[PDB]
């Protein structure tokens, strides 16, 4: 895997170039955010059990056929594996948020997830609804203050929303 600092280095080694003066000034801004990025990863991780469970609770209220006999989440092994997957996706979205690059997200979670759910019969349109419910529980948790100093984080919540949309289109 490689983060956002290692991303521009790998793009520059393949050209055989030193980094520019403009490119160092663009990596100073990524360090200048710095603490605001670590606030989003702190808020998402600290409420990780309640984000997964209460957005599984709201999925079975709107699609109650998934827990009927003959549904894809009806049994204890088949329900516990469903909550386990929703915690796997929230894990690698927080990994992609601390790194600034969606490379650990697809190389270790997403590549082969569509092929897995097509061999098992898991409804892929219902997985993306569970992904989109953890999204707006987390982008509403991102832009509340709650012991953070007041400022503008609207550029880092568009990046966190883009990692949830990436995980949702790799399964739908």
């Amino acid at each position: 895997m490689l983060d956002a600092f290692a991303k521009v280095v790998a793009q520059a080694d393949a050209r055989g170039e030193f980094l520019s003066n403009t490119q160092i000034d663009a990596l100073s801004k990524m360090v200048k955010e710095g603490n605001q990025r670590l606030d989003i990863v702190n808020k998402v991780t600290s409420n990780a059990s309640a984000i997964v469970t209460n957005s599984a609770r709201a999925l079975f209220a709107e699609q109650p056929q998934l827990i009927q006999p003959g549904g894809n989440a009806y049994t204890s092994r088949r329900m516990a594996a469903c909550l386990r997957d929703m915690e796997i996706v929230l894990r690698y979205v927080s990994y992609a948020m601390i790194a600034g690059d969606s490379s650990v997200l697809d190389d270790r979670c997403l590549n082969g997830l569509r092929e897995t759910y097509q061999a098992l019969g898991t409804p892929g349109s219902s997985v993306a609804v569970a992904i989109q419910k953890m999204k707006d529980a987390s982008v509403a948790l991102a832009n509340d203050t709650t012991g953070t100093p007041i400022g503008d984080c609207s550029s880092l919540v568009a990046e966190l929303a883009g990692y949830f949309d990436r995980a949702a289109v790799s399964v739908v």
């Binding site: 520019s20 409420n47 309640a50 984000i51 469970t53 957005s55 609770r57 709107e62 568009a158």
Partner: protein
């Protein structure tokens, strides 16, 4: 420095401010360089020819090139020395005809193609509407370009993959009355209480139907299970105080010819609204 309208505009340093085609040479410090070029190559006696790029040529200059003209003052020197030509002297536009070559002040030699009224100097084009101005004293000809004469021998050091590839940031578009609903689902259900089912949204009206059976948010409230033993008697009140009112006094709105009735029977759950509720009013209890 001073105002350009002093001494008329007869001064050489103030004339190009007056003939306002090249305003970038005084907005930047480029006019110090071309005065230092003709010191350095002794062009003050013999006649020559300049091709000044206009305003708009400086504006269409690329951001991967305009950065490299700031971090390298040697690159600004020979680019401005690449516009001063000493082949034909004070040459007009009619002597720039055919195809041929031209010797710059510093750089190798640059080929021109001049075909009638369109004249190219090699990645440049002379706009001939204002280009035949000749100064008598310190004598040269000045013509106007629309692009800088950029030789390819200078700019193999530049590229767009340095970091000048343009990127726009996209931000999320959520409304503040919607993510205030969604913060209550982040807490666990022992401390979030009733707010733990806040993530379910409004389904369409057929999704609560008997094939699909989507559960409303009110099934998770205690207001669905309000089934008491006690009951109001309604006969112990004064006559005229018990009020009742029907929904519509019509046979055809209470029940249509199909069973899609909003008021009678089990099809009262098939409303397009009334899927979610306001239980972020109270408490996290």
């Amino acid at each position: 420095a001073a105002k350009p309208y002093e001494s008329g505009y007869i001064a050489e340093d103030d004339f190009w401010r007056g003939r306002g085609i090249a305003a970038w040479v005084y907005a930047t410090g480029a006019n110090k360089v071309i005065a230092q070029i003709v010191k350095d190559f002794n062009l003050t006696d013999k006649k020559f020819m300049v091709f000044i790029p206009n305003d708009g040529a400086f504006a269409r200059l690329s951001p991967q090139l305009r950065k490299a003209m700031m971090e390298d003052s040697r690159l600004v020197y020979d680019m401005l020395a690449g516009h001063i030509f000493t082949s034909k002297g004070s040459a007009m536009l009619k002597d720039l005809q055919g195809a041929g070559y031209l010797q710059p002040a510093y750089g190798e030699a640059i080929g021109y193609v001049g075909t009638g009224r369109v004249i190219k100097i090699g990645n440049a084009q002379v706009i001939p509407e204002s280009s035949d101005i000749l100064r008598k004293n310190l004598g040269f000809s000045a013509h106007t370009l629309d692009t800088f004469i950029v030789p390819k021998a200078l700019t193999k050091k530049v590229s767009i993959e340095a970091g000048f590839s343009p990127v726009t940031p996209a931000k999320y578009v959520s409304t503040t009355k919607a993510d205030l609903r969604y913060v209550g689902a982040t807490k666990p259900a022992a401390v979030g209480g009733r707010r733990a089912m806040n993530l379910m949204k409004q389904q369409p009206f057929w999704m609560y139907g008997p094939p699909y059976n989507a559960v409303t948010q009110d099934e998770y409230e205690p207001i669905s299970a309000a089934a008491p033993k006690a009951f109001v008697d309604y006969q112990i009140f004064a006559p005229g105080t018990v009020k009742v009112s029907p929904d519509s006094v019509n046979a055809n709105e209470l029940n249509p010819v199909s069973g899609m009735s909003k008021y009678i029977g089990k099809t009262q759950k098939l409303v397009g609204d009334q899927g979610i509720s306001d239980r972020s009013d109270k408490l996290p209890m």
